[PDB]
């Protein structure tokens, strides 16, 4: 017989890690 | 007949979130 | 012919962005 369909769609990516911290405030 | 081929790669992650506020300025 | 594998999982998430500047200090 003949070759199959494509497969279903892999997984979505795992989700990006959260930003860092933010820079020191300003002084006064 | 033989499987398919494999499917498509998945899509992209989340971005990740914005970091949180940086630590306090100097005193003054 | 059966149905292919599944694809790949997808590539990471881009990082988030820094957060803003702390508050003024005391």
């Known amino acids: 017989g003949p070759p ?3 497969g279903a769609r892999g ?3 795992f989700p990006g ?3 860092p911290p933010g820079p ?3 002084p006064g």
Do not use: C, L
């Open 17 to 19: 890690e959260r930003g």
């Open 11 to 13: 997984e979505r990516g």
């Open 24 to 26: 020191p405030g300003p």
């Open 4 to 6: 199959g369909p494509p």
